[PDB]
Coordinates of all heavy atoms in Angstrom, one line a residue:
Chain D
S100 N -22.3 -2.1 -49.5 CA -21.8 -1.5 -48.3 C -20.3 -1.4 -48.3 O -19.6 -2.2 -48.9 CB -22.2 -2.3 -47.0 OG -21.7 -3.6 -47.1
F101 N -19.7 -0.4 -47.7 CA -18.3 -0.2 -47.6 C -17.8 -0.5 -46.2 O -18.1 0.4 -45.3 CB -17.9 1.2 -48.1 CG -16.4 1.5 -48.1 CD1 -15.6 1.0 -49.1 CD2 -15.8 2.1 -47.0 CE1 -14.2 1.2 -49.1 CE2 -14.4 2.3 -47.0 CZ -13.6 1.8 -48.1
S102 N -17.2 -1.6 -46.0 CA -16.7 -2.0 -44.7 C -15.4 -2.8 -44.9 O -14.9 -2.9 -46.0 CB -17.8 -2.9 -44.0 OG -18.2 -4.0 -44.8
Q103 N -14.9 -3.4 -43.8 CA -13.6 -4.0 -43.8 C -13.6 -5.4 -44.3 O -12.5 -5.9 -44.7 CB -13.0 -3.9 -42.4 CG -12.8 -2.6 -41.8 CD -12.2 -2.6 -40.4 OE1 -12.0 -3.7 -39.8 NE2 -11.9 -1.4 -39.9
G104 N -14.7 -6.0 -44.4 CA -14.8 -7.4 -44.8 C -14.4 -7.7 -46.2 O -14.1 -6.8 -47.0
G105 N -14.5 -9.0 -46.6 CA -14.2 -9.4 -47.9 C -14.4 -10.9 -48.1 O -15.1 -11.5 -47.2
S106 N -13.9 -11.5 -49.2 CA -14.2 -12.9 -49.5 C -12.9 -13.5 -50.0 O -11.9 -12.8 -50.3 CB -15.3 -13.0 -50.5 OG -14.9 -12.5 -51.8
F107 N -12.9 -14.8 -50.1 CA -11.7 -15.5 -50.7 C -11.6 -15.1 -52.1 O -10.4 -15.1 -52.6 CB -11.9 -17.0 -50.6 CG -12.1 -17.5 -49.2 CD1 -13.1 -18.4 -48.9 CD2 -11.3 -17.0 -48.2 CE1 -13.3 -18.9 -47.6 CE2 -11.5 -17.5 -46.9 CZ -12.5 -18.4 -46.6
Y108 N -12.6 -14.8 -52.8 CA -12.5 -14.4 -54.2 C -11.8 -13.0 -54.4 O -11.2 -12.8 -55.4 CB -13.9 -14.3 -54.9 CG -13.9 -13.9 -56.3 CD1 -13.3 -14.7 -57.3 CD2 -14.5 -12.7 -56.7 CE1 -13.3 -14.3 -58.6 CE2 -14.5 -12.3 -58.0 CZ -13.9 -13.1 -59.0 OH -13.9 -12.7 -60.3
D109 N -12.0 -12.2 -53.3 CA -11.3 -10.9 -53.4 C -9.8 -11.1 -53.5 O -9.1 -10.3 -54.2 CB -11.6 -10.1 -52.1 CG -13.0 -9.4 -52.1 OD1 -13.4 -9.0 -53.2 OD2 -13.6 -9.3 -51.1
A110 N -9.2 -12.1 -52.8 CA -7.8 -12.4 -52.9 C -7.4 -13.1 -54.2 O -6.4 -12.8 -54.8 CB -7.4 -13.3 -51.7
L111 N -8.3 -14.1 -54.7 CA -8.1 -14.7 -55.9 C -8.1 -13.7 -57.1 O -7.3 -13.7 -58.0 CB -9.0 -15.9 -56.1 CG -9.0 -17.0 -55.1 CD1 -10.1 -18.0 -55.4 CD2 -7.6 -17.7 -55.2
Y112 N -9.2 -12.9 -57.1 CA -9.2 -11.8 -58.1 C -8.1 -10.8 -57.9 O -7.5 -10.3 -58.9 CB -10.6 -11.1 -58.0 CG -10.7 -9.8 -58.8 CD1 -11.2 -9.8 -60.1 CD2 -10.2 -8.6 -58.3 CE1 -11.3 -8.7 -60.9 CE2 -10.3 -7.4 -59.1 CZ -10.9 -7.5 -60.3 OH -11.0 -6.3 -61.1
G113 N -7.6 -10.6 -56.7 CA -6.6 -9.6 -56.4 C -5.3 -10.0 -57.0 O -4.6 -9.2 -57.6
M114 N -4.9 -11.2 -56.8 CA -3.5 -11.6 -57.3 C -3.5 -11.6 -58.8 O -2.4 -11.3 -59.4 CB -3.2 -13.0 -56.7 CG -4.1 -14.2 -57.2 SD -3.7 -15.7 -56.5 CE -4.7 -16.9 -57.4
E115 N -4.6 -11.9 -59.5 CA -4.6 -11.8 -61.0 C -4.6 -10.4 -61.4 O -4.0 -10.1 -62.5 CB -5.8 -12.5 -61.5 CG -5.8 -14.0 -61.3 CD -5.0 -14.8 -62.4 OE1 -4.3 -14.1 -63.2 OE2 -4.9 -16.0 -62.3
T116 N -5.2 -9.5 -60.7 CA -5.4 -8.1 -61.2 C -4.3 -7.2 -60.6 O -3.7 -6.4 -61.4 CB -6.8 -7.6 -60.8 OG1 -7.8 -8.5 -61.2 CG2 -7.1 -6.2 -61.3
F117 N -4.0 -7.2 -59.3 CA -3.1 -6.3 -58.7 C -1.7 -7.0 -58.6 O -0.7 -6.3 -58.6 CB -3.5 -5.9 -57.3 CG -5.0 -5.5 -57.2 CD1 -5.8 -6.2 -56.4 CD2 -5.5 -4.4 -58.0 CE1 -7.2 -5.9 -56.4 CE2 -6.8 -4.1 -57.9 CZ -7.7 -4.8 -57.1
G118 N -1.6 -8.3 -58.4 CA -0.4 -9.0 -58.2 C -0.2 -9.3 -56.7 O -1.1 -9.2 -55.9
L119 N 1.0 -9.7 -56.4 CA 1.4 -10.0 -55.0 C 2.7 -9.3 -54.7 O 3.6 -9.1 -55.5 CB 1.5 -11.5 -54.8 CG 0.3 -12.3 -55.0 CD1 0.6 -13.8 -54.9 CD2 -0.8 -12.0 -54.1
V120 N 2.9 -8.9 -53.4 CA 4.2 -8.4 -52.9 C 4.5 -9.1 -51.6 O 3.6 -9.5 -50.9 CB 4.1 -6.9 -52.7 CG1 3.6 -6.2 -54.0 CG2 3.4 -6.5 -51.5
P121 N 5.8 -9.2 -51.2 CA 6.1 -9.9 -49.9 C 5.7 -9.0 -48.8 O 5.4 -7.8 -48.9 CB 7.6 -10.0 -50.0 CG 8.0 -9.9 -51.5 CD 7.0 -8.9 -52.0
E122 N 5.6 -9.7 -47.6 CA 5.2 -9.0 -46.4 C 6.0 -7.8 -46.1 O 5.5 -6.7 -45.6 CB 5.3 -10.0 -45.2 CG 4.9 -9.4 -43.8 CD 3.4 -9.2 -43.7 OE1 2.7 -9.7 -44.5 OE2 3.0 -8.6 -42.6
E123 N 7.3 -7.8 -46.4 CA 8.2 -6.7 -46.0 C 7.9 -5.4 -46.7 O 8.2 -4.3 -46.2 CB 9.7 -7.1 -46.3 CG 10.1 -8.4 -45.7 CD 9.7 -9.6 -46.5 OE1 9.9 -9.6 -47.7 OE2 9.1 -10.6 -45.9
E124 N 7.3 -5.5 -47.9 CA 7.1 -4.3 -48.7 C 5.9 -3.5 -48.2 O 5.8 -2.3 -48.5 CB 6.9 -4.6 -50.2 CG 8.1 -5.3 -50.8 CD 9.4 -4.4 -50.7 OE1 9.2 -3.2 -50.8 OE2 10.5 -5.0 -50.5
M125 N 4.9 -4.1 -47.5 CA 3.8 -3.3 -46.9 C 3.4 -4.0 -45.6 O 2.5 -4.9 -45.7 CB 2.7 -3.1 -47.9 CG 1.8 -1.9 -47.6 SD 0.6 -1.6 -48.9 CE 1.5 -2.2 -50.3
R126 N 4.0 -3.6 -44.5 CA 3.7 -4.3 -43.2 C 2.5 -3.6 -42.5 O 2.3 -2.4 -42.7 CB 4.9 -4.3 -42.3 CG 6.2 -4.6 -43.0 CD 7.3 -4.8 -42.0 NE 7.4 -6.3 -41.7 CZ 8.4 -7.1 -42.1 NH1 9.4 -6.6 -42.9 NH2 8.4 -8.3 -41.7
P127 N 1.8 -4.4 -41.7 CA 0.7 -3.7 -40.9 C 1.2 -2.8 -39.8 O 2.2 -3.1 -39.2 CB -0.1 -4.9 -40.3 CG 0.9 -6.0 -40.3 CD 1.8 -5.8 -41.5
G128 N 0.6 -1.7 -39.7 CA 0.9 -0.7 -38.6 C 2.2 0.1 -38.8 O 2.5 1.0 -38.0
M129 N 2.8 0.0 -40.0 CA 4.1 0.7 -40.2 C 3.9 2.2 -40.2 O 4.8 3.0 -39.9 CB 4.7 0.2 -41.5 CG 3.9 0.5 -42.8 SD 4.6 -0.1 -44.3 CE 6.1 0.8 -44.4
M130 N 2.6 2.7 -40.6 CA 2.4 4.1 -40.7 C 2.0 4.8 -39.4 O 2.2 6.0 -39.3 CB 1.2 4.3 -41.7 CG 1.6 3.8 -43.1 SD 2.8 4.8 -44.0 CE 4.3 3.8 -43.6
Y131 N 1.6 4.1 -38.4 CA 1.2 4.6 -37.1 C 2.1 4.0 -36.0 O 1.6 3.8 -34.9 CB -0.3 4.5 -36.8 CG -0.9 3.3 -37.3 CD1 -1.1 2.2 -36.5 CD2 -1.5 3.2 -38.6 CE1 -1.7 1.0 -36.9 CE2 -2.1 2.0 -39.0 CZ -2.2 0.9 -38.1 OH -2.8 -0.2 -38.6

Side-chain angles (χ1 to χ4, degrees):
Chain D
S100 61
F101 183 79
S102 55
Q103 298 179 354
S106 65
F107 303 135
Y108 180 65
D109 284 326
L111 297 175
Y112 171 94
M114 64 184 189
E115 294 278 2
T116 307
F117 317 117
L119 301 173
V120 311
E122 178 76 7
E123 307 83 47
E124 298 300 325
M125 207 175 324
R126 318 189 91 106
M129 61 183 300
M130 298 291 96
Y131 37 93

